[PDB]
Amino acid sequence: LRNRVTDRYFRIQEVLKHARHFRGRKNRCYRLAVRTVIRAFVKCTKARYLKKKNMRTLWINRITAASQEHGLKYPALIGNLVKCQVELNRKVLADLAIYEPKTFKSLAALASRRRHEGFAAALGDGKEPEGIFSRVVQYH
Amino acid sequence: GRIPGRQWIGKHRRPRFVSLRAKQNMIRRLEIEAENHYWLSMPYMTREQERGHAAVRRREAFEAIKAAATSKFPPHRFIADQLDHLNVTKKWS
Amino acid sequence: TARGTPSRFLASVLHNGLGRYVQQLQRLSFSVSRDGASSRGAREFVEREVIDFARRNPGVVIYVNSRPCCVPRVVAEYLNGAVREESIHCKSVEEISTLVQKLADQSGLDVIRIRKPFHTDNPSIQGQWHPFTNKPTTFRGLRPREVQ
Amino acid sequence: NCNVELALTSDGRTIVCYHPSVDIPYEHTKPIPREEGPMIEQLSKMFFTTKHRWYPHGRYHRCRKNLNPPKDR
Amino acid sequence: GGQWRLQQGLAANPSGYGPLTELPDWSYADGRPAPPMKGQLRRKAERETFARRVVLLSQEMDAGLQAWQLRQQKLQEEQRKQENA
Amino acid sequence: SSFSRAPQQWATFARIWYLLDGKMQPPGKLAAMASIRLQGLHKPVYHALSDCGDHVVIM
Amino acid sequence: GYVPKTSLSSPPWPEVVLPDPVEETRHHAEVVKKVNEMIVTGQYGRLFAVVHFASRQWKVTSEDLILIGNELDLACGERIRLEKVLLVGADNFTLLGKPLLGKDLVRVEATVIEKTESWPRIIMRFRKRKNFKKKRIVTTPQTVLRINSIEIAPCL
Amino acid sequence: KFTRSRIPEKVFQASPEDHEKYGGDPQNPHKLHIVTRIKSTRRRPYWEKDIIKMLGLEKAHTPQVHKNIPSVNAKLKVVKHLIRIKPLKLPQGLPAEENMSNTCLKSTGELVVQWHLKPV
């Protein structure tokens, strides 16, 4: 047995240290543990995409809850903070909804105001003055 | 309520219907398509005027390709690599 | 994975940039072998950069020894008493100098998962939300179907 | 609810919102007034939950619970 | 909401060009400007190469037109001169 | 703001009772309002595991 | 033109009439004068600010921490003036910009505390029945900032 | 058999209703196209994958400037359902060497050679 592998304990414990919190003989026996630990690492690397996706639908749920509380909806709040060139993202808005609700009150009121201006400026088509908050900022 | 073979292959298939989503999506791709049809209609040079207007730039670009193919040859070999490797027995006295 | 690994919230050590910044690394212990091949690059660092490094940032005290029991090494000790021990086995001078600045650049806190990318301790100014922030009051505090 | 005073500064590159905190009026306020199975029914109906939340659980499950977890904020 | 952005001449994606990508994110408290961001260096260089190509193409187009006018005028000079003697 | 830790948390998470008259109404608009309020989807504190749902009394 | 009041004549959302621009600019002048006269006298408490740093916006209160997934090429402890402030709020007013508040109005300053690696992040690919199995470990660079000042100028 | 498709000539002869709607002038036609790819070439025949590589449009939603000559017109016409063609407008002059660093492409198709970002 001119040279046989002596360094094998350490392969097995590379793999078995990521399996100690498992259930059943997958926490202790190597063939079973190999399968499940590879399966664990694969789930980790697809769960990065699912973590970003989960975070954004949680933000949409919270902002919807706060703006449904202030009369608006989610589309009215977002698609009217767009039209004022207010570029907050969802994370900021959901944090504002929880921790600073007079500022969310201000945002929901501004969004509804700009909504009614963006219809009443669009209800009287033809030449008029434009609305107050329908005035854009050009960058040149 | 079963579809006989596989759902979307065969003689008998599960029916698929057109949402207003699908009609709107297809109609707006048609609008983009139509503007493309418009702008491909006013060509600047006529087909005789372009004959040769950039032969020089194509020939120089191909000479770059051609001389980029032939300038291929093994790398230079130096001494300092060899003796740089004598350094792997180096110490402090 | 992350379910397997410990996890900690984000922190400083002791309000580390509020009043003044404190260089959080105390010690380093290079242990470079005289006649040893694995410490080759480490020895070059000691002749080349470690005086410049020790003069660049004086908050650290630096010990250069000979003959470790296993592997040439840096022993970084921080002001929360943590020890990070890195092996500089078979490394060139570039990699060692980046690792030593890596050690200086950090705080003693572990390199386990940080649960949040942010840490506020006074999070809320206009008052945190409770179900009675925006709800309107009644008259005489009555509830629905309350007679008088 | 919303009672805020919204404005632009004159140039129109900011939006200033004025929102004071409105206190609750005094009139809108009241004066202060001065076995094991049947166990799980009584607790469930006290706390409005299903029975399953109060059934105990194994040593193995109680042995994965972290008892020095990180706090924050 | 990026159809409204396209109508107004803003970009559909506000993280494209705008103040929120092409201003610098930070500066020293003393007032010294930052090193330029490596994304912004990359994007300015993309913009460089694009404008270089537009200039090259425009020169090739109009040089082709002028060369065709020269071919026609020299042909007509030869037409008028071969109708002599 | 400026509550103590336990009362600020107690104010935030503790549950509310909502009456909801059901006369002449369809059972699905009642169900849609009541389902949103039973899950906790009317709170900006909403998390799936938070167990933040409220009480609904449909008469 | 006149329509009797039936079910579907006037749509169910409420009718609000936009005020004329003259008294509305009078109103805006009154509001801006109130808010600026608060700012000149310090009638506010502590401030928060939504700030568009590295690629994503943070809600930043003074005296706190922000972890940023890149190496910022700044020596440790070094002060920074976080430009691109895009909301600044207090207990009794806010100021949001379109999209950015001016640099002449809000100063937000931070420091760089620490410049770490992250934890090792495992990237495993696996395709089955195909002997396809790859593993990578990525340690990302991270820098932690501490935000010191949110100071507001009364230039409205 | 599905094959290549000759598009009839009459499709690319615009009417005056076009010239009112779009902003073109049939007299004095424009310099260059800005072409965007908006539709992947997967699930498309190999000749359209070839022409997308030849036009340099590989990355979706990336503008590419192409000459308004007939030859580029023919390559574009085969792949006109994958792309978007806008005229390259020049409001000012084309960028001289001085400002050719400090340029911009505007979404309306036009290239403005002075890149500011300040309030006006």
UniProtKB/Swiss-Prot annotation, chain A:
Q: Which GO terms describe its cellular component?
A: mitochondrial inner membrane; mitochondrial large ribosomal subunit; mitochondrial ribosome; mitochondrion
- Hydrolase among keywords: no
Q: Which GO terms describe its molecular function?
A: RNA binding; rRNA binding; structural constituent of ribosome
Q: Which Gene3D superfamilies match?
A: Ribosomal protein L20
Query: What keywords were assigned to this record?
Result: Mitochondrion, Ribonucleoprotein, Ribosomal protein, Transit peptide
Instruction: List this protein's GO terms for biological process.
Output: mitochondrial translation
Q: What is its main location?
A: mitochondrion
| Subcellular location field | Mitochondrion
Q: Could you tell me the superkingdom of the organism this chain comes from?
A: Eukaryota
Q: Which family does it belong to?
A: Belongs to the bacterial ribosomal protein bL20 family.
Report quaternary structure and partners. Answer: Component of the mitochondrial large ribosomal subunit (mt-LSU). Mature mammalian 55S mitochondrial ribosomes consist of a small (28S) and a large (39S) subunit. The 28S small subunit contains a 12S ribosomal RNA (12S mt-rRNA) and 30 different proteins. The 39S large subunit contains a 16S rRNA (16S mt-rRNA), a copy of mitochondrial valine transfer RNA (mt-tRNA(Val)), which plays an integral structural role, and 52 different proteins. Interacts with OXA1L.
What's the name of the protein?
Answer: Large ribosomal subunit protein bL20m
Q: Which organism is it from?
A: Homo sapiens
Please name the gene that encodes this protein.
MRPL20
Swiss-Prot record, chain C:
User: Which protein, by its recorded name, is this?
Assistant: Large ribosomal subunit protein mL43
Q: Report the locations given in the UniProt record.
A: Mitochondrion
- Top-level taxonomic group: Eukaryota
Q: Which organism is it from?
A: Homo sapiens (Human)
Tell me the subunit arrangement. Component of the mitochondrial large ribosomal subunit (mt-LSU). Mature mammalian 55S mitochondrial ribosomes consist of a small (28S) and a large (39S) subunit. The 28S small subunit contains a 12S ribosomal RNA (12S mt-rRNA) and 30 different proteins. The 39S large subunit contains a 16S rRNA (16S mt-rRNA), a copy of mitochondrial valine transfer RNA (mt-tRNA(Val)), which plays an integral structural role, and 52 different proteins.
Q: Which GO terms describe its biological process?
A: mitochondrial translation; translation
- Let me know which tissues express this protein, per UniProt: High relative levels in skeletal muscle and testis. Lower levels of expression in the heart, brain, placenta, lung, liver, kidney, pancreas, spleen, thymus, prostate, ovary, small intestine, colon and leukocytes. Expression is coregulated with TWNK.
Q: Which residues of the full protein are shown?
A: 2 to 149 of 215
Family the UniProt entry places it in? Belongs to the mitochondrion-specific ribosomal protein mL43 family.
Presence of the UniProt keyword Membrane in the record: no
Pull one GO CC term from this UniProt entry: mitochondrion
- Classification of source organism: Eukaryota, Metazoa, Chordata, Craniata, Vertebrata
Q: Name one GO molecular function term.
A: structural constituent of ribosome
Q: Which UniProt keywords apply?
A: Mitochondrion, Ribonucleoprotein, Ribosomal protein, Transit peptide
Curated annotation (Swiss-Prot), chain F:
Q: List modified residues, type N-acetylserine.
A: 1
Q: Where are the transmembrane segments?
A: none
Q: Where in the cell is it found?
A: Mitochondrion
Coiled-coil parts of chain: none
Top-rank lineage group of the source organism: Eukaryota
Signal peptide stretch: none
Please state which protein family the record places this protein in: Belongs to the universal ribosomal protein uL13 family.
Under the subunit heading, UniProt states: Component of the mitochondrial large ribosomal subunit (mt-LSU). Mature mammalian 55S mitochondrial ribosomes consist of a small (28S) and a large (39S) subunit. The 28S small subunit contains a 12S ribosomal RNA (12S mt-rRNA) and 30 different proteins. The 39S large subunit contains a 16S rRNA (16S mt-rRNA), a copy of mitochondrial valine transfer RNA (mt-tRNA(Val)), which plays an integral structural role, and 52 different proteins. Interacts with OXA1L.
Name-wise, this protein is Large ribosomal subunit protein uL13m
Q: Which organism is it from?
A: Homo sapiens
Instruction: Write the span of the intact protein that is present.
Output: 2 to 60 of 178
Curated annotation (Swiss-Prot), chain H:
What are the annotated GO cellular component locations?
Answer: mitochondrial inner membrane; mitochondrial large ribosomal subunit; mitochondrion
One biological process term in Gene Ontology: mitochondrial translation
The subcellular localization recorded is:
Mitochondrion
Indicate where this protein is primarily found. Answer: mitochondrion
Which UniProt keywords are present, listed alphabetically? Mitochondrion, Ribonucleoprotein, Ribosomal protein, Transit peptide
Signal peptide from the UniProt entry: none
A GO molecular-function descriptor:
structural constituent of ribosome
The UniProt subunit note reads as follows: Component of the mitochondrial large ribosomal subunit (mt-LSU). Mature mammalian 55S mitochondrial ribosomes consist of a small (28S) and a large (39S) subunit. The 28S small subunit contains a 12S ribosomal RNA (12S mt-rRNA) and 30 different proteins. The 39S large subunit contains a 16S rRNA (16S mt-rRNA), a copy of mitochondrial valine transfer RNA (mt-tRNA(Val)), which plays an integral structural role, and 52 different proteins.
Q: Which family does it belong to?
A: Belongs to the universal ribosomal protein uL30 family.
Name this polypeptide is given: Large ribosomal subunit protein uL30m
Q: Which organism is it from?
A: Homo sapiens (Human)
Q: What gene does this protein come from?
A: MRPL30
Q: Which start and end residues of the full protein are shown?
A: 35 to 154 of 161
